[PDB]
Write an enzyme that holds these catalytic residues in place. Structure first.
Site, PDB file in Angstrom:
ATOM      1  N   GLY B   7       0.788  -1.226   0.000  1.00 57.47           N
ATOM      2  CA  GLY B   7       0.000   0.000   0.000  1.00 57.47           C
ATOM      3  C   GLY B   7       0.826   1.285   0.000  1.00 57.47           C
ATOM      4  O   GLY B   7       1.556   1.560   0.954  1.00 57.47           O
ATOM      5  N   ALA B   8       0.691   2.082  -1.058  1.00 61.01           N
ATOM      6  CA  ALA B   8       1.440   3.334  -1.197  1.00 61.01           C
ATOM      7  C   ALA B   8       0.738   4.625  -0.758  1.00 61.01           C
ATOM      8  O   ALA B   8       0.839   5.644  -1.433  1.00 61.01           O
ATOM      9  CB  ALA B   8       1.925   3.487  -2.644  1.00 61.01           C
ATOM     10  N   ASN B  10      -0.124   7.485   2.521  1.00 62.79           N
ATOM     11  CA  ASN B  10       0.711   8.097   3.552  1.00 62.79           C
ATOM     12  C   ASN B  10       1.235   7.162   4.651  1.00 62.79           C
ATOM     13  O   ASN B  10       2.329   7.381   5.174  1.00 62.79           O
ATOM     14  CB  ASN B  10      -0.016   9.273   4.214  1.00 62.79           C
ATOM     15  CG  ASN B  10      -0.268  10.421   3.256  1.00 62.79           C
ATOM     16  OD1 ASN B  10       0.284  10.468   2.153  1.00 62.79           O
ATOM     17  ND2 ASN B  10      -1.102  11.363   3.680  1.00 62.79           N
ATOM     18  N   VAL B  11       0.470   6.135   5.007  1.00 66.68           N
ATOM     19  CA  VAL B  11       0.887   5.213   6.067  1.00 66.68           C
ATOM     20  C   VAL B  11       2.018   4.261   5.655  1.00 66.68           C
ATOM     21  O   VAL B  11       2.966   4.056   6.416  1.00 66.68           O
ATOM     22  CB  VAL B  11      -0.327   4.376   6.604  1.00 66.68           C
ATOM     23  CG1 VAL B  11       0.130   3.403   7.686  1.00 66.68           C
ATOM     24  CG2 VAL B  11      -1.383   5.298   7.190  1.00 66.68           C
ATOM     25  N   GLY B  12       1.919   3.685   4.460  1.00 72.30           N
ATOM     26  CA  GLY B  12       2.945   2.762   3.992  1.00 72.30           C
ATOM     27  C   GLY B  12       4.260   3.440   3.602  1.00 72.30           C
ATOM     28  O   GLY B  12       5.337   3.057   4.076  1.00 72.30           O
ATOM     29  N   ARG B  87     -20.553   1.164   9.031  1.00 71.54           N
ATOM     30  CA  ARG B  87     -19.607   0.348   9.780  1.00 71.54           C
ATOM     31  C   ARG B  87     -19.468  -1.045   9.178  1.00 71.54           C
ATOM     32  O   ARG B  87     -18.371  -1.610   9.151  1.00 71.54           O
ATOM     33  CB  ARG B  87     -20.036   0.221  11.240  1.00 71.54           C
ATOM     34  CG  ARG B  87     -19.124  -0.687  12.040  1.00 71.54           C
ATOM     35  CD  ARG B  87     -19.544  -0.785  13.492  1.00 71.54           C
ATOM     36  NE  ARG B  87     -19.618   0.525  14.130  1.00 71.54           N
ATOM     37  CZ  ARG B  87     -19.712   0.709  15.443  1.00 71.54           C
ATOM     38  NH1 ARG B  87     -19.736  -0.338  16.258  1.00 71.54           N
ATOM     39  NH2 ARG B  87     -19.791   1.937  15.940  1.00 71.54           N
ATOM     40  N   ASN B  94     -12.517  -4.027   3.539  1.00 70.23           N
ATOM     41  CA  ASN B  94     -11.276  -4.398   4.192  1.00 70.23           C
ATOM     42  C   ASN B  94     -11.076  -5.904   4.339  1.00 70.23           C
ATOM     43  O   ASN B  94     -10.026  -6.421   3.967  1.00 70.23           O
ATOM     44  CB  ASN B  94     -11.174  -3.698   5.549  1.00 70.23           C
ATOM     45  CG  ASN B  94     -10.933  -2.184   5.412  1.00 70.23           C
ATOM     46  OD1 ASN B  94     -10.999  -1.621   4.312  1.00 70.23           O
ATOM     47  ND2 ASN B  94     -10.659  -1.525   6.535  1.00 70.23           N
ATOM     48  N   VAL B 117      -1.878  -3.700   9.909  1.00 71.25           N
ATOM     49  CA  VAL B 117      -2.223  -2.322  10.259  1.00 71.25           C
ATOM     50  C   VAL B 117      -3.524  -1.927   9.542  1.00 71.25           C
ATOM     51  O   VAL B 117      -3.812  -0.745   9.347  1.00 71.25           O
ATOM     52  CB  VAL B 117      -1.091  -1.335   9.842  1.00 71.25           C
ATOM     53  CG1 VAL B 117      -1.284   0.000  10.533  1.00 71.25           C
ATOM     54  CG2 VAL B 117       0.265  -1.909  10.192  1.00 71.25           C
ATOM     55  N   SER B 118      -4.300  -2.929   9.139  1.00 70.58           N
ATOM     56  CA  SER B 118      -5.573  -2.691   8.460  1.00 70.58           C
ATOM     57  C   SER B 118      -6.675  -2.583   9.519  1.00 70.58           C
ATOM     58  O   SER B 118      -6.689  -3.347  10.485  1.00 70.58           O
ATOM     59  CB  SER B 118      -5.859  -3.844   7.503  1.00 70.58           C
ATOM     60  OG  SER B 118      -4.727  -4.095   6.689  1.00 70.58           O
ATOM     61  N   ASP B 147      -1.688   3.900  20.915  1.00 67.48           N
ATOM     62  CA  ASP B 147      -2.553   4.494  21.936  1.00 67.48           C
ATOM     63  C   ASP B 147      -1.694   4.823  23.140  1.00 67.48           C
ATOM     64  O   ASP B 147      -1.921   5.833  23.815  1.00 67.48           O
ATOM     65  CB  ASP B 147      -3.706   3.549  22.346  1.00 67.48           C
ATOM     66  CG  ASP B 147      -4.709   3.310  21.217  1.00 67.48           C
ATOM     67  OD1 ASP B 147      -5.003   4.259  20.458  1.00 67.48           O
ATOM     68  OD2 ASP B 147      -5.217   2.174  21.095  1.00 67.48           O
ATOM     69  N   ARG B 150       0.014   8.391  22.173  1.00 66.83           N
ATOM     70  CA  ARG B 150      -0.866   9.541  22.411  1.00 66.83           C
ATOM     71  C   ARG B 150      -1.164   9.751  23.899  1.00 66.83           C
ATOM     72  O   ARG B 150      -1.125  10.869  24.388  1.00 66.83           O
ATOM     73  CB  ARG B 150      -2.195   9.359  21.688  1.00 66.83           C
ATOM     74  CG  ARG B 150      -2.116   9.276  20.173  1.00 66.83           C
ATOM     75  CD  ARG B 150      -3.520   9.242  19.571  1.00 66.83           C
ATOM     76  NE  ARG B 150      -3.524   9.315  18.112  1.00 66.83           N
ATOM     77  CZ  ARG B 150      -4.030   8.374  17.324  1.00 66.83           C
ATOM     78  NH1 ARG B 150      -4.571   7.284  17.858  1.00 66.83           N
ATOM     79  NH2 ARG B 150      -4.013   8.529  16.002  1.00 66.83           N
ATOM     80  N   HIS B 174      -9.636  -0.510  20.092  1.00 66.42           N
ATOM     81  CA  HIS B 174      -9.951   0.913  19.973  1.00 66.42           C
ATOM     82  C   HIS B 174     -11.389   1.201  20.411  1.00 66.42           C
ATOM     83  O   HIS B 174     -12.054   0.340  20.990  1.00 66.42           O
ATOM     84  CB  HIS B 174      -9.736   1.395  18.529  1.00 66.42           C
ATOM     85  CG  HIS B 174      -8.309   1.329  18.070  1.00 66.42           C
ATOM     86  ND1 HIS B 174      -7.280   1.969  18.730  1.00 66.42           N
ATOM     87  CD2 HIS B 174      -7.741   0.715  17.001  1.00 66.42           C
ATOM     88  CE1 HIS B 174      -6.145   1.755  18.089  1.00 66.42           C
ATOM     89  NE2 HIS B 174      -6.398   0.997  17.036  1.00 66.42           N
TER      90      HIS B 174
END
Lengths: 292, 305, 305, 290
Positions: B7-8, B10-12, B87, B94, B117-118, B147, B150, B174
């Protein structure tokens, strides 16, 4: 050590985060016109603190009063010549109303013309206004060579002056590997090739992403300039500075080698170019005065 | 050490870059289904080798064949939750995406360690596990660490001390599933209940619960990535250098905490072989029940797919 | 990645410590024939992990069994000449120690890469390589980096720039064996002959030739170790991280520079496999002569052993 | 940022280098009494810059004039042992103050608490700018002892140690955790008792080994820990020797207690909740250290 970055796009933010990671600042502030985005990126970054092991203080914002007392200010506000001209002009007039004497680092485009504008509106000694363009062209040229020979990029050096595109001026005679000139390792035309790729280097990345522009290499380059100023290293890097005699050019900005310390441009380096190269350099500085 | 990041977005990309910059791999592949995006970010990332002082081979691709024999794989494809989206609408995309990626890379890497991280984490971590066919000790999800991050930075803003001297204990998942254990949250080995007012502690705990939402509120589009990307790398490091860090992560249980067979975020010892030890701390009633509660609910969604 | 360091004086300890604090190994052994010193120092380095943030197994001993299967072995036994010592005496004591140690290390480690740092350099690197049995690409000596290091530090004191923007080319060996190449010594790709008058250059050149002695003048009863230990590691890093750095080291030749079978210091590419390529640079006749000549000097001393 | 180290033995030497390598300074100065030593080690470190990749100006010296305008000064000189080292600290101090207006001072002698006191008075500075290192070291050893016991990273172990060294050390078991968990829920009381014992005699253990000298790698890394907090203004919380004016019921004495280190030194002292057992021991510690 307090630093302000104007522009919350990929370049500005990537720069900001790298600065806090290497602990090259005590305070930092990300600023932009649009409400929202900056405050967001700054908080995320700050929350990265317990993992990165850094105690910097990041905060995004839309109010220039936060930029007050900044030792270093980076301008990434760029998108065309008319558009960016008024932008840099306005950004500068504002930052100056809150910071007495900062080192400005322009990052717009066309890069030279824009670094010229910032300086005139800053009312600062030209030894405090610079442009980032040499470190980037040099980083790509260095990477293509490493691909060609297969050696650590830490042992390569590339000499690049002028501007971008057809106004770029690379100096083969000073591009070496472990000290060895490149013309004793690769054929002449094989080198003419690695050069052309460097001119169109920025338009290649754009060709892929379909949207936007490169930002990992460009932002890291800016931080090398910052690291030298902050740590007072005295590095020698190619940047867009204001000349006044050297290379036969006077009253205009061009990219040439310079020494960088806690006070900015602490020394310009004038080097021996041959006929064809020196000619171009003087030819590049001309179009600038043609639009400034 | 070969490492693949799927996955390209921002996260990857941010995770790939930071891994290269830290010299934690010799080779690195960035793969996504899109056309030029992984190619471009990959090249620009490599062109940084000079400035950054690293020599990692970096390639952006669309062909899974490029990930052959990876030692570690990191899944980020998917995305959190597009605003105004159902939801269950996201539990479909996913889940379908995660089981497809896992499917494709097992075709080229026989025994990697995988990090998910999905979103939602605890559920997707379970999906990747079963589809892979690997022992549970070799599949973990990243969630507790972020968590704890933060939450640790909020206690810092309040007391004015170094974020390196604060330990935050956070179990569960979460949303309302998170189980922040304050009796084990300290500053120089001193319980924050000895310093802060109970009224303030509760407010700090609640901000952590909606921490991701806070970022998205300002960004308008897309979600946080700097802290997440870095939390993923802290885990990578413990593996690559066999540190044996005691970190909170999503793993399948087999009896501890009364729970069995479900993926729950708890204290684990991380090494070169993955989950090397799981700790069962003495939670007080209220916390224990809350954990067994959000555990059974997870079992449900796994039984609605 | 297991690493062993023979000799616990000041050069051995300093290197062992710097490898841990830099996280280049998981295991690290410090060997030394006398019972007591290797113990106390290793333990002291280990009790430093909480503060340096590293998890590396460290220990010192008096038994070669604890070095079993090391990937990299470093020898610092064979102290340099002493005040009242002749080149004959040193070459004798040291060759006797350097081969008894090599014998022991090969009696527990089958295929390690060995880095020699004993005196005299080029000769001891040859002695170890013949007792080892390994291909020559896996036995190298440290000298070129330390010399080029001092030279660069000198040019910086002169022009006031970053020691990081200066390339210093140095071949041959120590003392009058040294062959510093000016034509290829630069600052930001600029040859120093374009930035300095001939007189100064020659002084920097001669300060480099006697550099070590300059440090003994101040120390009075011992030699340098901080700079020497770091040069060692610079090399260790290229091997462990497969960087492929171009550095001058003591390696066996077979043709280039018209030299054969003798150990000389030249520019070589360093990777996970030891020596992966040797460069033949366009030296000027005068320097080329100094090299070939100095080499036969090694051939002479080797036969009298 | 300019720092000065006093004493060229193994401790101060290792100390000056770590600072240079971490880029925590612009100008470093290694000063000692005898000639040669400080100039040799100093040049050695400087010639390392092309490889360590730093540009710190290092210099060895024997003339106090080079230490003018220092921000941080680290006194590590130390060999009637009490009156022996006491006089050495007094001398070193007077001179320094002769060349620096307002610097932060870190004492590293023996006995530490008393030495930091002697340095403070002659200093004539606010007690907030004179401190001694000791707690951080005993904790690093305790932290490593446990890690050897459980097999876990040393970055996730927290240790609480107050008072002085040896029989004056006061370990606080209830604040010794592992990722937040008290260690009394992980290890037996007998095991803990030995881990505490081994710490009390921690330095004599390295000494009985070396047979000639003393530890210095851990001791030096500890001091650099304190320096970084001050330089980078992190606000770390570490156990250091400071002067008390009431806390823990102890008055007018230097004893080890948790504190917060910022640019201006001691920015806050913490008075933690000890148990009637240890508290009484900490009072009897400062008793003789008084």
């Amino acid at each position: 050590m307090k630093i302000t970055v104007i522009g919350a796009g990929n370049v500005g933010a990537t720069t900001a985060f790298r600065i806090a990671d290497k602990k090259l600042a005590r305070e930092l502030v990300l600023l932009d016109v649009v409400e929202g985005i900056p405050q967001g990126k700054g908080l995320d970054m700050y929350e990265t603190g317990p993992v990165g092991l850094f105690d910097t203080k990041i905060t995004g914002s839309n109010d220039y009063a936060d930029t007050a007392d900044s030792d270093i200010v980076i301008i990434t506000a760029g998108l065309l010549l008319m558009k960016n001209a008024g932008i840099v002009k306005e950004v500068t007039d504002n930052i100056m109303k809150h910071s007495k004497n900062p080192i400005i680092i322009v990052v717009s485009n066309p890069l030279d013309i824009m670094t010229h504008v910032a300086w005139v509106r800053s009312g600062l000694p030209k030894e405090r206004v610079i442009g980032m363009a040499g470190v980037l062209d040099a980083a790509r040229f260095r990477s293509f060579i490493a691909m060609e020979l297969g050696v650590s990029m830490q042992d390569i050096n590339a000499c690049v002056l002028g501007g971008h595109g057809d106004a770029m001026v690379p100096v083969v005679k000073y591009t070496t590997v472990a000290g060895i000139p490149i013309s004793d390792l690769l054929p002449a035309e094989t080198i003419d090739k690695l050069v052309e790729r460097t001119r169109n280097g920025g338009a290649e990345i754009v060709e892929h992403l379909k949207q936007g522009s490169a930002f990992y290499a460009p932002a890291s380059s800016v931080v090398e300039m910052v690291e030298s100023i902050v740590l007072d290293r005295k590095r020698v890097l190619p940047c867009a500075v204001g000349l006044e005699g050297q290379y036969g050019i006077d009253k205009t900005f061009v990219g040439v080698p310079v020494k960088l310390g806690r006070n900015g441009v602490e020394q310009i380096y004038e080097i021996n170019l041959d006929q064809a190269d020196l000619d171009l350099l003087q030819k590049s500085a001309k179009i600038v005065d043609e639009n400034c």
